[PDB]
Amino acid sequence: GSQDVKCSLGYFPCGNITKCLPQLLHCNGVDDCGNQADEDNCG
């Protein structure tokens, strides 16, 4: 029954926003999530 939960394999959610992007854009130094959550202290 749950819907829009987590992202499929090979993708990750920006956080509390409904959206998923490939690891390629993860900490890639590019604005995409909008809230800059993926670029938040990437380490």
Interface residues with Ca ion (CB under 5 A)? 25, 28, 30, 32, 38
Q: Could you tell me if 5 and 18 are in contact, meaning their C-beta atoms sit under 8 angstroms apart? A: no
Question: Considering beta carbons, is residue 3 or 18 the nearer one to Ca ion?
Answer: 18
Q: Using CA of residue 41, residue 18, residue 5, residue 28, what is the dihedral sign?
A: negative
What is the chain's length?
A: 43
* Cβ at position 4, least distance to Ca ion in Å: 20
Which of the 8 DSSP states describes residue 13? Answer: E
Do the annotations mark residue 30 as ligand-binding? yes
* Cβ at position 21, least distance to Ca ion in Å: 7
- List residues forming the annotated binding site for Ca(2+): 25, 28, 30, 32, 38-39
